[PDB]
Amino acid sequence: ANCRILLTPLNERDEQRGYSTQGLKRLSGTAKLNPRLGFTRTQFVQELPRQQKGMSISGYQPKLQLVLDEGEFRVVDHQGNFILKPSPADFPGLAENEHATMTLMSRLGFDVPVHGLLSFAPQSEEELEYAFVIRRYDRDNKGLPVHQEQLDGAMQITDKYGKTGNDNEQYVSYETLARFLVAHVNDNIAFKIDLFRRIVYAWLLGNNDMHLRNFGLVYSDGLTPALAPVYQFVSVAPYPEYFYSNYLALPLLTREEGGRELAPGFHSDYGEYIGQDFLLLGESMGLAPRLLEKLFQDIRKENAIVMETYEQSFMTQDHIQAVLQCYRHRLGLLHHH
Amino acid sequence: ANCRILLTPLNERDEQRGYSTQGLKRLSGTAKLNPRLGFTRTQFVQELPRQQKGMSISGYQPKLQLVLDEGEFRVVDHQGNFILKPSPADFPGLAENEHATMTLMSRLGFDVPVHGLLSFAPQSEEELEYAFVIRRYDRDNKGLPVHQEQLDGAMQITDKYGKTGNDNEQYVSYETLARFLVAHVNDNIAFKIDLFRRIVYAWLLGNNDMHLRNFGLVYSDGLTPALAPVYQFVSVAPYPEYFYSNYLALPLLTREEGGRELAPGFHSDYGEYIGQDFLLLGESMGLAPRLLEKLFQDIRKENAIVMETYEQSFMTQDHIQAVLQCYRHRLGLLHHHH
Amino acid sequence: PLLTIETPRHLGEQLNARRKELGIDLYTLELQTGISTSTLKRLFKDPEQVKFGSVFAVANVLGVKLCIGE
Amino acid sequence: PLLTIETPRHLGEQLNARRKELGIDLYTLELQTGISTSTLKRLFKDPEQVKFGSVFAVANVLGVKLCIGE
Amino acid sequence: HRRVKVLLYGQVVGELSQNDSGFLFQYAHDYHGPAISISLPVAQRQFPSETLHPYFASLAPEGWLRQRYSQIQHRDENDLLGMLIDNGKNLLGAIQILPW
Amino acid sequence: HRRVKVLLYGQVVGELSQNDSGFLFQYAHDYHGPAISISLPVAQRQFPSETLHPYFASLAPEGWLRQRYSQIQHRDENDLLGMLIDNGKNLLGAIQILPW
């Protein structure tokens, strides 16, 4: 009864279709879009053997390049306008996870490309398999290429996680990264709040793989760069090994680089990142203390949206149960200054 | 007694020479300049017939181009560094008139090129004849050409008095000239005050010949132009046929352009320009009233300089007296304001 | 992209226009800058009677740079 | 020919330097503009606490243009 | 009728032409330096006029200097307004008027 | 061990070469437009380095997309500027990696 694009309830006229007219409009730019793909999974997604074992979940996700031919999707081999991310073979339901999270991000007001869930043509009367589709952000209105760059390259960092030393420690942090960003984009307060909330919400939602290749710079309005939209936002809470590996992808504070110093929350009885650690991050960004208090109050008010969006999503419940456990836990830690 | 360059009193040393060393330095940059020219007037100045009459007295003035070879002045026909201005044949003592006026303008703080009086080589034991010499402002320290341009061409006016129709009426005014200037130079208050004082002193001293070609634009600071220094300031008061032609070269206020309207001073019982007229001029350039009240007071306290400079100048006593009623009469009219 | 400020009202009008295109409400500016909302509504219409430091502060928190030329 | 104002103090020193290079004294500015000489001295030291209209007024008197960029 | 080169600071910035309908001052399409006069902006490039542009007329000397030059060199008192070519090298400022 | 060309917004910006000692990136001397990265300013123009420049190294894919090419072709990461050419027409942005 919920929309496979917007996760909003369907309206009788749309219930049988499974997609609201609002969602089909938002994705394609046309209301006559066919979200039922005309190809099966195995027709274009060829599974390679063995893969790896120590890779992050994103490294197992296949990517297909899609284009919109007269309201119908068609797989191209080079330069598409859409990207289709099916669930990896070993992580069933990941596409519904990315769709759930990125819908929440969009509902919380972040800059998110239009996205949704498309289904593969069935093979033999099995349950329909749905995959995650998203519009590419390095294209403009006429589908013309827009230049972009990932942060690992801009910061001249050789590793997604900053493991650039003679040990196993990380030498780039979210604080250090934010200081780099304000040096090269427009320093307005609206940008600083958004970036601060991206970091707090990656922690709250369990995205411990927001590394330097998941930040981007878009060269749209002339030579001045802008922060790229949210992407690759998945909650790792349903997967306990990958989740218990790290609290976030990067150290939160600059004092933590190289394992030289611990975040204040690590010395507390909670032993993880807490609210005072995120206050110190905001302080370094130049956010006023009065503002951060209000910023924290807003985040508390948004758990209503967080509960709702995940509960009306298409993930498996034991996965939804996992995300809300992590969220409620870390949202509780924000109160400790 | 007084220096032929600076008009300041000479000391015993320099009395017989007629020139102070401090003035010889201002003119040339060297203390052993020879201001006694090594050529006669008829050597270079041809005696030209008097063409018509009733023009400007400057339209009869010869001009010679001089260069400084060592401490000696030398006549060239191509681009020089000095301009020598003899007294016109029909107007004796005009060179001493420009020197007195120009020295005064320099003493009143205006931007004035260095200048003075030089003597022609005599023919046979006669009265020494003096001419006005002045350094060109379109030259820098190295003597390299600096670009400039006169106002009539800048404003695209085909006559220096603005008689651009067959009314014979004047169609450009000092109010309109200043409005054009601030459009193309930097409008700092320092520029406006200098310009406003230039126009008031042209009226005070009897310079009814500040036409559009006695204004200039200098292009020194790259693209930004600046108003040229003061040049061609002479008092017409000694010469009545020319002095009663106009109170000023151009109409004062834009309301008088082409004769459509009269300045308030002409409607008053004084019948000429008065203090109110120059308030309306400055109050059109953006000068605040409290500033204009102060600017008038500074002009009153400078009357000590005007008396002193002219009385010690090298003009005939009848000429000095003519200029000083013009100054004293018009300086009083500055009081009739509000 | 350079715009010469003609009057103080001009600057106030541009800054308020900039603020709205960034989606920033007044309460956020009060919390960040410490300038009261009443003074901010003042600044965004005519900042003629507003301290220069506040106008300069609001311009910075909005990403606006101030220049001078001749 | 453009200078980015870094701080309010940076603006005051630039204007005061422009004022001195033009030969204008404080009493001339008080008559033209109406801002007192004591406040003009504060304007050229640190105009953080001076009304923005007073700073804009002085900059026009000195031939200084005020622009905004991003 | 006549065609003459215009140069500022020793380098040619354009050309002044005269025909039957009038005069035409032209900046060279490759000159992007300072303008010779605020009456002739570099951005406009081409300048037509039936009578001589007021800038060019004003560079000619007048008075005693126009009399000494015209008593010995008979130029057409008005039709040929190019007395500037004869005086081109003795102009005020950094401008020269030189024949082709 | 190739000399490969880089393409931004469809126009040649320069070329990236691999020699004996290391790599060298060369903004073409006539290019005065936007730079392909903030790590690579147009002003420096020349860019030598021992290892692959951190920009181009990050332009190469890493996940399921890299294991596809590592399954068919599989050069065991022996040609560092020579893994970008397998997808030089599949890069994010307006950048292209094209041989000669």
Numbering used by the authors:
A (entry chain F): 2 to 338
B (entry chain C): 2 to 339
C (entry chain D), D (entry chain A): 38 to 107
E (entry chain B), F (entry chain E): 2 to 101
What is written in the article reporting this PDB entry?
Enteropathogenic *E. coli* (EPEC) O127:H6 encodes an additional, tripartite TA module, *hipBST*, for which the HipT toxin was shown to specifically target tryptophanyl-tRNA synthetase, TrpS. Surprisingly, the function as antitoxin has been taken over by the third protein, HipS, but the molecular details of how activity of HipT is controlled remain poorly understood. We also show how auto-phosphorylation at two conserved sites in the kinase toxin serve to dually regulate binding of HipS and kinase activity.
To understand the molecular basis for the functional and structural differences, we determined the crystal structure of HipBST from enteropathogenic *E. coli* O127:H6 expressed with inactive HipT (D233Q) to 2.9 Å by molecular replacement using HipA_Ec_ as search model ([Fig fig2]). The refined structure (R=19.5% / R_free_=22.8%) has two copies of each of the three proteins in the asymmetric unit and is generally well-defined for HipB and HipT, while HipS appears to be more flexible. Analysis by the protein interaction server, PISA, suggests that the biological assembly is comprised of a dimer of HipBST heterotrimers, which are held together through dimerisation of HipB ([Fig fig2]). In this complex, the two HipB monomers interact strongly (interface area = 1,405 Å^2^) while the interface between HipB and HipT is relatively small (513 Å^2^). In the HipBST crystal structures, we find the Gly-rich loop of HipT forms a short α-helix and is in a conformation most similar to the ejected form of the HipA_Ec_ loop despite HipT not being phosphorylated ([Fig fig3]). In this conformation, Ser59, which is known to undergo autophosphorylation in HipT, forms interactions to several active site residues, including Asp210 and the Ser57 auto-phosphorylation site. We conclude that inside the HipBST complex, HipT in its non-phosphorylated state is maintained in an inactive conformation that does not support ATP binding. Near the Gly-rich loop, HipS Glu63 points directly into the HipT active site while Trp65 is wedged into a deep cavity formed by the HipT Gly-rich loop in its outward conformation. We conclude that Trp65 is essential for the ability of HipS to inhibit HipT, presumably either by increasing the affinity of HipS for HipT, or by preventing the Gly-rich loop from adopting the conformation required for ATP binding.
